[PDB]
Design a protein around this ligand. Structure first.
Ligand SMILES: CCc1c(C(=O)NCc2cccc3ccccc23)[nH]c(C)c1C(C)=O
Length: 115
């Protein structure tokens, strides 16, 4: 049950790269949400634990995931936050749904492998 951080990064980065490759859908998720810049002062009231692709990448890069379910949980936290805050007609919401479709296909074989 022990995963070296470098091993995790090698196995999990391609799944992250798949999400980054999605244009236009990944662009709202490439950086943390800035509520002041975006003019959405209630964002941190609704979303208690922000997450985005840049933070997930940094966590992979700095060895902050002890095991792979932590990585999957952060990706899903990103998705759930967007589905929670944004209305169903918004680009972010629909883009989130696309990323989730792309992620589920990428992650299955990798998680089976890592076990
Ligand atoms: C709505 C604010 C928000 C964004 C966001 O960065 N918006 C600006 C933006 C930047 C780049 C491309 C975009 C493409 C389409 C739409 C907005 C884009 N990202 C998330 C996750 C949220 C929330 C609240 O969940």
């Amino acid at each position: 049950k022990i995963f070296k951080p470098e091993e995790l990064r090698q196995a999990l980065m391609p799944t992250l790269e798949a999400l980054y490759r999605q244009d236009p859908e990944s662009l709202p998720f490439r950086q943390p949400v800035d509520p002041q810049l975006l003019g959405i002062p209630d964002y941190f009231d609704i979303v208690k634990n922000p997450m985005d692709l840049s933070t997930i990448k940094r966590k992979l890069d700095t060895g902050q995931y002890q095991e792979p379910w932590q990585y999957v949980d952060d990706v899903w936290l990103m998705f759930n936050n967007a589905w929670l805050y944004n209305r169903k007609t918004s680009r972010v919401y629909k883009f989130c749904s696309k990323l989730a479709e792309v992620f589920e296909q990428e992650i299955d074989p990798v998680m089976q492998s890592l076990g």
